[PDB]
Write a protein that binds this DNA or RNA. Structure first.
Length: 225
RNA sequence: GUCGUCAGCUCGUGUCGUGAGAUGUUGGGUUAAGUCCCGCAACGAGCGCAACCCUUUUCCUUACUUGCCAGCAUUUCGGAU
């Protein structure tokens, strides 16, 4: 499930943000600047990505659960589809404040969503009249877009795989608080201090995020033990 | 009694701060209303608002006296009979 380097180049992982938006903590990876934007070399990307894939594969072999976090508009559909393929918990919409550090309260949310979903599955919704049907149905819609991804999830995850560390800094902080390891895609304008497995690469390209999520999901499925 | 029928007043877990505290309850529309809908380190609850109670406006069913009189008949022309 390794990515080689040519696939990374075709995806476009080598691009970064403009030089004036950089974070000086990525000097080791930034390599050079072809234009007014930085170019992240894939020579450091490939091995770190391979270690991340190996770690996730070992976690899947041990049967641990790896949560997926991407909330950008570009990466939302990709994380949704790939996490559905991999059968692991996912967070598509905005990170709720206290999803992990305040899991006890989110549990009740999962429970009443399941309850009202079973109500819709059975005939209680049918005997509920039309206007009651309608506000309970948008109750469905909002709660499902809010926490549908973590509905199967019943405990704290063993790893957190994140698309944009800056865009999802809150999740990284909660993971640091609870001690759970983080694998994340960091870019030139990003802070890598609280990421245990730091893979450097592009984050805006839909090809790049698709490649990353494909590698992650294929490793998780390839656990097979 | 009064502010005043004013729309406000609080609580638990989680975060930020050495701390008193803060957040949530703020931000944009809307409403008679913290009324409702969107966003957001917050996620969840109660008392308040509204409704449930009484009365009035249209119709139906049951009930036909001590109340009623459209049709019939008799009338001292008084539903008087």
């Amino acid at each position: 499930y390794n990515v080689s380097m040519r696939d990374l180049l075709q995806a476009g992982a080598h691009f970064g943000h403009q030089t004036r938006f950089w974070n000086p903590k990525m000097r080791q990876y930034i390599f050079g600047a072809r234009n007014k934007i930085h170019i992240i070399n894939l020579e450091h990307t490939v091995p770190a990505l391979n270690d991340a894939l190996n770690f996730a594969n070992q976690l899947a072999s041990k049967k641990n659960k790896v949560l997926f976090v991407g909330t950008k508009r570009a990466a939302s559909n990709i994380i949704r589809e790939q996490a559905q393929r991999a059968g692991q918990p996912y967070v598509d919409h905005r990170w709720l404040g206290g999803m992990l550090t305040n899991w006890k309260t989110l549990r009740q949310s999962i429970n009443r969503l399941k309850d009202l979903q079973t109500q819709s599955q059975d005939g209680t919704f049918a005997k509920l009249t039309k206007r009651e049907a309608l506000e309970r149905t948008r109750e469905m819609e909002k709660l499902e877009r809010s926490l549908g991804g973590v509905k199967n999830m019943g405990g704290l995850p063993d790893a957190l795989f994140v698309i944009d560390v800056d865009h999802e800094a809150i999740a990284i902080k909660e993971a640091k608080n609870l001690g759970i390891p983080v694998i994340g895609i960091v870019d030139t304008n990003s802070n890598p201090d609280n990421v245990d497995y730091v893979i450097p690469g592009n984050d805006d390209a839909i090809r790049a995020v698709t490649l990353y999520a494909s590698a992650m999901a294929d490793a998780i499925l390839a656990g097979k033990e």
